[PDB]
């Protein structure tokens, strides 16, 4: 499987709300990808979504662009080989 590494995270307001932009380093290159923040009642970081999150939902091409897609089983689903949930934790041990 293809490592990766998070750099150059930063929080924008993004139409009207907030969300994490942030470059997804592979040794096959890096994206720049964008995914919702939300805050507990104070404000403060809690989480990054993974659910109804922007990456899933529109920036899959951009996610895999940087994946060595070769050795994945046809049958299973490009967002599902790559390791999304890893990524999004790693996204989050940034914003602690």
């Given at each position: 499987?293809?490592?990766?590494?998070i750099?150059?995270?930063?929080?924008?307001?993004?139409?009207?709300?907030?969300?994490?932009?942030?470059?997804l380093?592979?040794?096959?290159?890096?994206?720049?990808?964008?995914?919702?923040?939300?805050?507990?009642?104070?404000?403060?970081?809690?989480?990054?979504?993974?659910?109804?999150?922007?990456?899933?939902?529109?920036?899959v091409?951009?996610?895999?662009?940087?994946?060595?897609?070769?050795?994945?089983?046809?049958?299973?689903?490009?967002?599902?080989?790559?390791?999304?949930?890893?990524?999004?934790?790693?996204?989050?041990?940034?914003?602690?």
């Open positions: 499987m293809t490592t990766f590494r750099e150059n995270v930063r929080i924008e307001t993004i139409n009207d709300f907030d969300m994490v932009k942030f470059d380093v592979t040794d096959l290159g890096r994206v720049e990808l964008a995914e919702h923040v939300n805050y507990d009642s104070e404000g403060d970081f809690k989480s990054v979504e993974y659910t109804d999150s922007n990456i899933r939902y529109n920036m091409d951009e996610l895999c662009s940087v994946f060595d897609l070769t050795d994945k089983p046809s049958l299973m689903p490009a967002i599902d080989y790559v390791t999304f949930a890893e990524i999004i934790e790693a996204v989050e041990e940034m914003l602690e």
